[PDB]
Design a protein around this ligand. Sequence first.
Ligand SMILES: [Cl-]
Ligand SMILES: [Cl-]
Ligand SMILES: [Cl-]
Length: 129
Amino acid sequence: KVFGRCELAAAMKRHGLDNYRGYSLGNWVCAAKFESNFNTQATNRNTDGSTDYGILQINSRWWCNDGRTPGSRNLCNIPCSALLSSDITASVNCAKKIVSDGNGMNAWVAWRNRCKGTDVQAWIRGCRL
Ligand SMILES: [Cl-]
Ligand SMILES: [Cl-]
Ligand SMILES: [Cl-]
């Protein structure tokens, strides 16, 4: 599914990401914009042979099992394909685990490079939340 901006903001709030580990909602919407363009079916191969999946481009090296990432872990205990669903629940519960891990949202290179320090509140402008 390709989420609408305000549509994703509302689902992310409802699932408890607004200010999760101190990251306001616009941070999360911003990260999804630049990771997936709001498309739950986004997949992208990394140089290390791992793959990123879903609206938040959660990676198979640590976080999900795709059966084809040597030496990998599955810390969120999910098939990577569950991150592709139009239901963002597995993605959100997995993001919560990732962002508590130490480096916060820096774990999303696109967040660090494209969202961090910007007017991320713009990503939730106009939304009834
Ligand atoms: Cl915000
Ligand atoms: Cl694997
Ligand atoms: Cl932090």
